Amino acid sequence: WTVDIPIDLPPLPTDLRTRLDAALAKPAAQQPTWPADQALAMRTVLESVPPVTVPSEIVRLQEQLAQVAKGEAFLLQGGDCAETFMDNTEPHIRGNVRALLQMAVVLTYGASMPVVKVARIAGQYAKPRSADIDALGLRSYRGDMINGFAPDAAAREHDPSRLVRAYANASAAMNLVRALTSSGLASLHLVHDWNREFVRTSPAGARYEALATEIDRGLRFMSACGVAEIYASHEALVLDYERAMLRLSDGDDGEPQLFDLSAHTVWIGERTRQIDGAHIAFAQVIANPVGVKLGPNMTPELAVEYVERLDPHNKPGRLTLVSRMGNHKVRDLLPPIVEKVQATGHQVIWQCDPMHGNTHESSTGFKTRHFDRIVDEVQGFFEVHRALGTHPGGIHVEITGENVTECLGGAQDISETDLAGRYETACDPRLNTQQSLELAFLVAEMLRD
Amino acid sequence: WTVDIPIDQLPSLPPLPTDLRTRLDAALAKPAAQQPTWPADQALAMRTVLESVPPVTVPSEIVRLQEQLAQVAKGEAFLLQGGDCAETFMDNTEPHIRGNVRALLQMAVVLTYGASMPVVKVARIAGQYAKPRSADIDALGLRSYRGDMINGFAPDAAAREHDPSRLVRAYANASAAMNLVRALTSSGLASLHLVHDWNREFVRTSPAGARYEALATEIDRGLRFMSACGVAEIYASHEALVLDYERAMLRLSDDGEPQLFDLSAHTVWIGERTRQIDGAHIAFAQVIANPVGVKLGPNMTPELAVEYVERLDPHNKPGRLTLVSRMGNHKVRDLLPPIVEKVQATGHQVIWQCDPMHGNTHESSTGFKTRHFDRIVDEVQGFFEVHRALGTHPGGIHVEITGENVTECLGGAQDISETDLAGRYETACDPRLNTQQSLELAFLVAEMLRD
Ligand SMILES: [Mn+2]
Ligand SMILES: [Mn+2]
């Protein structure tokens, strides 16, 4: 029923303490409303636990994201919209790890350059809400780090013990993804046989067979000539969790720096990116690579201010700007943002989020996304970058290794009536096994010279 | 004082196949020694939670270990197994885990050079949270401490009661530790040169440094040679003691035939007090695919040793069974030879491993249970003298160590005394070799290994 843990370390450098305290004294949107004394007790437990990631892996990610920023690699970021403790199981994790590897080999062939793989995993347990009371009149579900999905009042109370449950689930998952990435799942030939089974059994396989066959000949060629790292990420939302997981280490200049060891990279969402808020200030104090989500109310001028605050030393790949405009708005809204930022001399990664600007409620009462709109935003994103001569750096996608019925369309041609089949997401609709693979194939075509 | 963390009750996955479960049932119907006395319905509730969690290890890693252990049994590799006697939840921290991983990597590079063949590294880590006790009642009049998977070290009645929620807390700690071990072995510690730079800092600052300096300099010259010519795996292990934990962690994988693996570790061993030939622990080791070890003490007969080979290695797979000698330094040269002769004649290929710690324990006048470095060294040496004389392979060592400057074992370069023991005796059970004493042993066994 309950685990019991008793409460009964070296100080930070004086300047890092001052800066951390100042970041956390700024106002913060979307925080849990639990008591400060209970939060503090939970953070004290987390301050001594083994970290989810280590500094050397974060420094290595930074070097790989620098190549992406310079136009010599591509970033694939993907996973569940919301991880749940309930589905934090071996089959679910393996299914997502495999999906990401499958998409990555397809994208690598299309881009003709390395693909950096960042999973939404081992921490994606918190979400923001526009309304604190939902459609059933209950306090809103804010992810398993905060409260329960169950539609009852007791379940929806904010519960600080979920910080520690979140850590435990994150460690366990990350342990498995490390294991899985040094196993036979690694092998590029095994990973691509899955894609060819997908081509054989998919209703739209004829659309993708030529490209699947060409990839298979590239792999066999490589072998005829004599011839896996998955990073963890989540939205840095709950500051009690992120601050508890900070650790001091010597950074890429040999001086002690603060690393958030809850993940390798984190991003700041649309509702928490206040320029003078705690999330942006917290991002300025940590050594991790960071991303900021940019929606349709973004100005070129605010985008530059984010770049100058978050990438003050002009470190290629330290900052990612994640575009989510809507498929009908991206072609008009993005170019002015890109031009103004390019002119600063900084090298950010431009990443497309084709999911969050394109959501709508179906007549059957399910929030859903159409495949054609998702594809069209990624396409428009590539067009904006071709015209300006800039690098389309990656995609940020929400997916699952399960055959869910959540997003409309694809090869399966999922309808409004089919959405009830198994709509399993705890939050936003995921592209299923098939639809995620389809998009990787379509984006690989977009990447071709 | 303490916080209560809810154990989420989550949906079950498919059950294990019916045929394999029937066989597991027959096996666990045998009597099991040294088990927790918590209620069966509470135990069942916690097993059900553990049956659906992500595993600590995966099958492909275990079949890789079996391949490397096969090389050890054939005389082509050497086994290094070491870590804390008792892992605690309180010391399951980054610095402590990093100190133990580093110590293992430091010992392994020195042993690799001396043996002239690969060294397989198995940590006592990520699950060594349970132990037997001979005593009903300890010296304070309390129920005995049984390790963190069972009860608390603190000397009070409430802490000492058997708490099945500690099964789940043990899993969380094991998972978190393993995650860090995986990260550390693909990090800067992977560098052979970095690891041996710590060995040469050891030679520079040790009082006995002159004893190891020639050999340290030689290893450094070998690494630089390798570099001049143009030119990362640590496994988890523990004593399989608490069957509620080990059975909840069984998972299906494929010989080609469906099989159970214990995915709480890569390899497990059966101790001196639970190795009853007709008991549940040996029966459990029969059913699982993992490589296994059995501890063998002074009361072992060559005949009972042969009964272990026939129970635990029916298919004659080299390296599947490791027999772990712990005789006492004064008894090893007399007692071990006939056991080895009898086993070799069966035609099976076991790994012969030395445990020089557990046969050599004694209590000081100052009241601390401790071990003398000279007795520990003398048993590994006697172990090497036995195998040389029979023409068999001294397959590895099983040692209890830590990466901190503790005062638990007497002797070494620092010449730790009975008075020094009270400085920092930090073990939750047996006296461990500290950072320095561990390294010294590795250097001396490197000399033993030299051709
Ligand atoms: Mn989402
Ligand atoms: Mn011991």
Side-chain angles (χ1 to χ4, degrees), chain A residues 1-251 253-449, chain B residues 2-451:
Chain A
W1 192 238
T2 78
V3 167
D4 285 17
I5 307 175
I7 296 173
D8 52 299
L9 327 101
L12 292 184
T14 316
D15 63 314
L16 298 186
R17 172 50 56 199
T18 296
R19 290 212 274 133
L20 183 56
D21 283 355
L24 297 173
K26 287 167 158 196
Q30 300 291 326
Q31 299 305 292
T33 67
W34 49 49
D37 62 306
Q38 293 179 18
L40 172 68
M42 295 299 98
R43 298 200 316 264
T44 309
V45 166
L46 293 181
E47 273 174 344
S48 49
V49 299
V52 175
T53 68
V54 300
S56 63
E57 296 165 350
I58 297 161
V59 169
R60 180 51 181 163
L61 178 55
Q62 177 65 71
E63 290 163 358
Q64 286 172 359
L65 297 176
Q67 287 291 90
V68 175
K70 293 170 182 156
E72 299 158 2
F74 192 78
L75 171 66
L76 167 65
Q77 190 158 5
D80 301 321
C81 171
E83 287 180 283
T84 72
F85 299 163
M86 205 204 82
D87 299 311
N88 195 35
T89 65
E90 195 275 343
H92 181 76
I93 292 164
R94 178 174 37 103
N96 284 17
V97 167
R98 175 165 140 284
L100 202 71
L101 288 172
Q102 281 181 249
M103 294 173 80
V105 63
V106 165
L107 293 164
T108 299
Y109 185 81
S112 299
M113 63 187 41
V115 172
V116 177
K117 295 168 290 302
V118 182
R120 304 169 59 116
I121 209 153
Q124 185 53 36
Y125 284 123
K127 61 177 183 145
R129 295 294 295 239
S130 291
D132 195 35
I133 289 132
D134 70 2
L136 302 192
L138 290 162
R139 284 194 86 189
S140 282
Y141 173 59
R142 285 173 184 276
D144 284 2
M145 189 178 293
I146 303 180
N147 59 1
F149 183 74
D152 78 276
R156 298 294 177 79
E157 278 298 296
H158 292 200
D159 177 3
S161 75
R162 286 173 172 281
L163 290 167
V164 176
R165 284 140 76 187
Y167 165 70
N169 281 271
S171 314
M174 189 72 222
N175 184 49
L176 179 60
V177 352
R178 289 175 193 282
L180 287 170
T181 52
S182 46
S183 81
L185 219 46
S187 157
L188 295 181
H189 280 78
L190 178 63
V191 170
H192 188 70
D193 295 340
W194 295 118
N195 293 339
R196 298 198 301 124
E197 173 67 11
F198 150 78
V199 166
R200 207 177 59 80
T201 68
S202 172
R207 180 65 186 84
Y208 308 112
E209 188 182 330
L211 192 45
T213 289
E214 206 184 322
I215 293 163
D216 180 62
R217 285 162 168 169
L219 287 172
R220 292 160 78 206
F221 179 60
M222 186 162 81
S223 165
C225 296
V227 181
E229 303 169 321
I230 294 177
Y231 297 99
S233 72
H234 59 268
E235 171 177 1
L237 182 53
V238 175
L239 294 177
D240 274 328
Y241 186 75
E242 307 307 328
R243 75 190 270 178
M245 295 297 296
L246 291 174
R247 302 287 188 273
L248 193 71
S249 203
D250 296 353
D253 51 2
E255 302 301 313
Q257 285 195 95
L258 283 170
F259 291 79
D260 191 344
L261 299 191
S262 77
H264 292 106
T265 176
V266 298
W267 72 87
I268 290 166
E270 192 87 329
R271 298 169 183 96
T272 48
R273 66 166 172 74
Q274 294 87 1
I275 198 68
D276 296 314
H279 293 86
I280 292 288
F282 186 89
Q284 298 183 269
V285 184
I286 66 179
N288 306 58
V290 288
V292 178
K293 299 297 215 73
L294 308 184
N297 89 323
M298 188 56 42
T299 64
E301 296 78 32
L302 191 58
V304 168
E305 185 67 12
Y306 286 122
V307 175
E308 283 171 350
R309 294 203 198 199
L310 290 165
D311 184 39
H313 302 107
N314 206 336
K315 299 296 176 198
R318 146 68 180 183
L319 180 57
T320 302
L321 294 183
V322 191
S323 179
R324 21 85 84 249
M325 302 304 186
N327 79 286
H328 58 306
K329 296 175 169 176
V330 63
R331 266 163 284 245
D332 296 329
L333 292 187
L334 193 61
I337 295 172
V338 177
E339 287 188 294
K340 205 77 171 183
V341 168
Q342 290 295 122
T344 61
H346 296 246
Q347 298 192 78
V348 301
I349 294 176
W350 298 102
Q351 193 188 27
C352 184
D353 174 355
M355 313 285 305
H356 289 99
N358 301 307
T359 317
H360 75 280
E361 191 193 321
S362 71
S363 58
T364 48
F366 295 98
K367 56 192 284 200
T368 188
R369 290 147 179 167
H370 209 114
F371 183 87
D372 284 2
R373 281 162 55 73
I374 290 156
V375 166
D376 188 58
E377 180 154 8
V378 184
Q379 176 138 224
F381 174 81
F382 272 83
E383 295 166 31
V384 167
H385 286 289
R386 300 328 200 194
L388 287 173
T390 46
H391 181 61
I395 58 177
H396 195 327
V397 150
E398 299 184 321
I399 64 176
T400 184
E402 270 97 22
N403 184 22
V404 303
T405 62
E406 286 166 24
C407 293
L408 296 173
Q412 296 152 307
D413 190 54
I414 296 176
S415 62
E416 284 188 301
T417 188
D418 299 352
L419 291 172
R422 54 155 155 169
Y423 193 92
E424 295 184 350
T425 182
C427 189
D428 290 320
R430 290 157 305 172
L431 295 158
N432 57 33
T433 176
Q434 276 199 45
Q435 296 167 332
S436 291
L437 270 44
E438 289 190 82
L439 183 69
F441 273 101
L442 291 177
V443 173
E445 281 189 18
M446 295 177 196
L447 285 157
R448 275 141 93 87
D449 306 288
Chain B
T2 94
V3 307
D4 289 12
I5 309 297
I7 301 165
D8 291 73
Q9 295 180 176
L10 301 171
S12 283
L13 302 167
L16 290 176
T18 300
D19 54 350
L20 295 175
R21 277 196 277 101
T22 303
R23 294 177 33 190
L24 183 71
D25 291 340
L28 294 184
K30 285 157 174 207
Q34 301 282 343
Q35 297 300 290
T37 66
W38 48 49
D41 65 344
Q42 299 181 13
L44 176 54
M46 298 298 87
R47 283 200 280 113
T48 297
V49 173
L50 294 176
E51 277 171 354
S52 58
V53 296
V56 176
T57 62
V58 296
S60 60
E61 296 167 356
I62 294 164
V63 339
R64 187 69 187 105
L65 178 57
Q66 184 61 66
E67 291 161 6
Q68 292 168 177
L69 290 188
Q71 298 172 214
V72 177
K74 294 169 180 162
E76 296 167 16
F78 190 81
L79 181 63
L80 172 53
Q81 189 158 8
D84 291 345
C85 172
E87 279 183 293
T88 68
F89 303 153
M90 187 190 82
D91 295 276
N92 195 33
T93 70
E94 192 267 349
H96 180 68
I97 291 158
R98 181 176 43 111
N100 283 27
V101 169
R102 193 232 272 206
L104 218 72
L105 290 167
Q106 274 182 270
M107 294 172 76
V109 70
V110 175
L111 294 167
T112 299
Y113 184 86
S116 300
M117 52 174 71
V119 172
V120 184
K121 297 171 289 313
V122 188
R124 297 174 64 112
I125 207 151
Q128 185 57 35
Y129 289 128
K131 73 198 205 164
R133 281 292 297 264
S134 31
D136 285 49
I137 309 177
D138 71 17
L140 293 177
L142 301 165
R143 290 189 76 175
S144 315
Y145 176 56
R146 294 302 310 279
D148 275 8
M149 185 181 289
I150 302 175
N151 63 1
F153 179 85
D156 62 88
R160 291 292 174 77
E161 286 305 280
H162 294 201
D163 179 8
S165 67
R166 284 172 176 282
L167 290 167
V168 171
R169 191 179 173 194
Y171 165 76
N173 277 273
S175 248
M178 196 67 215
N179 183 54
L180 184 57
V181 172
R182 294 175 184 284
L184 290 180
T185 48
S186 49
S187 87
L189 297 182
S191 173
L192 260 29
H193 255 286
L194 199 230
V195 180
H196 193 65
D197 286 345
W198 289 314
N199 292 340
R200 293 188 303 130
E201 184 58 34
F202 157 78
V203 168
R204 208 182 68 77
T205 69
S206 179
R211 180 62 181 95
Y212 310 114
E213 207 250 74
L215 181 50
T217 302
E218 210 192 315
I219 294 168
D220 185 61
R221 275 156 174 176
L223 289 163
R224 285 151 83 208
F225 179 63
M226 190 164 144
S227 182
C229 295
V231 178
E233 295 166 336
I234 298 189
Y235 296 97
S237 75
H238 62 273
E239 188 189 333
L241 195 270
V242 177
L243 291 183
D244 285 323
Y245 186 76
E246 303 305 331
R247 76 200 279 197
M249 296 302 297
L250 289 177
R251 301 288 188 273
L252 190 67
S253 173
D254 295 323
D255 24 67
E257 302 289 308
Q259 260 231 83
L260 298 165
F261 287 76
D262 191 344
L263 295 192
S264 77
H266 292 102
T267 175
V268 293
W269 74 83
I270 296 148
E272 191 83 348
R273 278 170 272 180
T274 48
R275 59 164 173 73
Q276 294 84 4
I277 199 67
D278 294 328
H281 289 89
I282 293 298
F284 185 84
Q286 289 189 63
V287 158
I288 72 183
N290 305 64
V292 294
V294 181
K295 294 297 217 74
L296 306 180
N299 298 334
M300 188 61 39
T301 60
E303 294 80 39
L304 179 53
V306 169
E307 282 185 67
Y308 291 129
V309 173
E310 287 166 350
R311 289 304 192 90
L312 299 178
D313 188 30
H315 305 129
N316 202 308
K317 299 296 180 202
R320 143 72 180 181
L321 179 63
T322 300
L323 293 176
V324 190
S325 185
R326 24 86 84 253
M327 302 295 180
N329 68 301
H330 61 304
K331 285 167 159 185
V332 68
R333 270 164 283 245
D334 305 282
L335 296 190
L336 188 56
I339 296 169
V340 177
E341 285 184 290
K342 254 279 196 290
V343 164
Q344 293 294 115
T346 69
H348 295 249
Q349 304 194 66
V350 306
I351 291 169
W352 297 107
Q353 195 180 22
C354 183
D355 173 6
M357 322 278 309
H358 291 99
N360 297 303
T361 309
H362 81 269
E363 189 188 304
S364 54
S365 52
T366 62
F368 301 84
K369 66 193 281 206
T370 184
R371 291 159 179 164
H372 204 141
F373 190 83
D374 285 10
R375 271 165 64 78
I376 293 169
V377 171
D378 189 49
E379 177 152 13
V380 188
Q381 200 166 16
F383 177 84
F384 271 84
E385 294 168 41
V386 166
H387 290 283
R388 293 262 183 281
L390 302 190
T392 51
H393 191 239
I397 55 173
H398 198 328
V399 96
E400 282 179 341
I401 67 169
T402 187
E404 296 141 326
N405 198 20
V406 295
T407 57
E408 300 170 3
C409 288
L410 304 171
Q414 299 162 118
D415 195 19
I416 292 151
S417 63
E418 293 192 314
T419 308
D420 301 348
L421 296 177
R424 38 193 308 213
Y425 194 96
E426 297 182 343
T427 189
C429 197
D430 293 327
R432 300 162 296 180
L433 295 168
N434 65 34
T435 173
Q436 275 189 59
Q437 296 171 322
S438 290
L439 274 40
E440 294 189 69
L441 186 74
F443 276 99
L444 297 168
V445 176
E447 293 188 18
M448 292 171 203
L449 284 158
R450 266 139 93 89
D451 297 19

